[PDB]
């Protein structure tokens, strides 16, 4: 009996990349476009309505204005492939694909989105020139929540203050106050999970 299959129940995709999620269905001889319906949706939002052999750009929700399309070439191979461009955190969730082709069936696809902490902004400020206290800051955004670890040239763990807010990208910022010298090297490391990821920046104390 007609059945839709999925290769992957779950997609983990990098933030701002392009997403191709797939629903597979039986196609014996050449594709009869008249009988084929393909419906992609998310949280009761109409994404793709492929009817009478042509996409109806009317019934689609505005959220997917430019960013959503079905790969026609793939249909002749029994692959309902939905490509979403420039994936954002709001695109995480459960997608359903529904195919009618001599029988009907639907499947759920779960989308999980990561955002790496790689744009790490830093700053070094002199707090008191006599004792040479400096304030060192490391800020970066991503998802999910990262903690920040401070290490010195020794790789001996230090004690900083970390504030986590929203942008919902997390904006993570961490400050270390410490007495130091010219040329001392410090590292700030953003440790995130889902999956694990350790992203480091380096701060070098400049001349006074």
């Amino acid at each position: 009996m007609f059945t839709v299959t999925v290769p992957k129940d779950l997609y983990v995709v990098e933030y701002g990349s392009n997403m191709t999620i797939e629903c597979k269905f039986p196609v014996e001889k050449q594709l009869d476009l008249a009988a084929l319906i393909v419906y992609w949706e998310m949280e009761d939002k109409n994404i793709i309505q492929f009817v009478h052999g042509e996409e109806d750009l009317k019934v689609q929700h505005s959220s997917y204005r430019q960013r959503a399309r079905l790969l026609k070439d793939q249909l002749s191979l029994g692959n309902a492939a939905l490509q979403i461009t420039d994936v954002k955190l709001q695109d995480a969730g459960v997608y359903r694909c529904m195919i009618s082709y001599g029988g009907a069936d639907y499947k759920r696809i779960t989308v999980k989105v990561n955002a790496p902490y790689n744009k790490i902004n830093q700053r070094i400020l002199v707090v008191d020139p006599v004792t040479s206290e400096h304030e060192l800051t490391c800020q970066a955004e991503g998802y999910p929540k990262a903690e920040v670890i401070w290490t010195s040239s020794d790789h001996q763990v230090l004690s900083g203050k970390t504030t986590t807010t929203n942008s919902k990208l997390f904006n993570v910022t961490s400050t270390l106050r410490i007495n130091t010298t010219t040329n001392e090297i410090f590292y700030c490391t953003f440790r995130r999970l889902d999956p694990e990821e350790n992203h480091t920046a380096e701060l070098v104390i400049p001349e006074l």
């Binding site: 009996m1 059945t3 319906i37 009907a104 069936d105 639907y106 499947k107």
Partner: protein, 112 residues
């Protein structure tokens, strides 16, 4: 809206289990799917009612019976096996005038 009950049903292996799928606005053009959930929470069609009749995907122990009042259905797992244990739900697919998937809440079968 669809309801699917009892929310939790146990029976001995070898015995039939009957759930009810109840629809608030049934018409004869709808297709009604009897679904099982996988561990990752994927739906897997067991049987489908359309055009007057129920038909199984690969095991005819999964039987949908339309009740006389027409908007209610018996989803029967006949001659149960321990392996039939899990979560099930019914779902309606509408093609006209608007595409719609409507799913009930899951109910649990425990076969002992």
């Amino acid at each position: 809206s669809l309801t699917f009950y009892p929310a939790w049903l146990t029976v001995s292996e070898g015995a039939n289990a009957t759930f009810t799928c109840s629809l608030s606005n049934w018409s004869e053009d709808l297709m009604l799917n009897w679904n099982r959930l996988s561990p990752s929470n994927q739906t897997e069609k067991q049987a489908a009612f359309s055009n007057g009749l129920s038909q199984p995907v690969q095991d005819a122990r999964f039987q949908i019976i339309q009740l006389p009042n027409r908007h209610d259905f018996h989803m029967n797992i006949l001659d149960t096996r321990r392996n039939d244990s899990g979560i099930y739900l019914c779902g309606a697919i509408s093609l006209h005038p608007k595409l719609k998937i409507e799913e009930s809440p899951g109910a649990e079968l425990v076969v002992t």
